[PDB]
Amino acid sequence: EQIRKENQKKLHEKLEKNGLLRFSAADANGPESYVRDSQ
């Protein structure tokens, strides 16, 4: 139980690192009728 709790802390810490890099960019949301004359 202490091992998996320390694991959950480590996964939250690396969640920060894996989430930080991919939004390094801007990521801005804002910026027929006829064929012939015979008809």
Added chain:
Amino acid sequence: STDFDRIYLNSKFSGRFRIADSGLGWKIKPFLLPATELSTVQWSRGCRGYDLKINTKNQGVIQLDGFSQDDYNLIKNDFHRRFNIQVEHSLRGWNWGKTDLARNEMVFALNGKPTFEIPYARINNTNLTSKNEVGIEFNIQDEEYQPAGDELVEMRFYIIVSFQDVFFTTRGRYDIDIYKNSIRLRGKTYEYK
């Protein structure tokens, strides 16, 4: 030459035309079109009113109508003697186009295919907005119930005694003016005669 009383020209009734070597005589007020003023011929069967559609340098387009399908072998027979010009718009119908301001017309060219060419003689008033929206309001000279036919009022595109402040129920607030033999109701809703 040829004479026909069933030639239709100009929101009006038909008229009369007279062919000649010096030019063309169109009588509704007689009008003479010289042979040195014509530039191009756009006679084709792709549009309604299959007749000659000539272009003139006198700020007008001769959009004559009321000719049979057998007249194209006849009228061009009068053209090979002196003019010697062979007559060859837009059929896509898409909303995409380009507006070009000519000397006397407004060319609507949808990728190299011109569709509309309205002369400035029938224009009455023009209005513009802040969003480059252009609205041309015209007044077709209606004379009778039979000869008027269908008539255009306004075209929009995107790029004696008169009274003021009159409240009417048949509902709103507008203005009314009295002409010589008519009355014009003008306002933000519509224009009525």
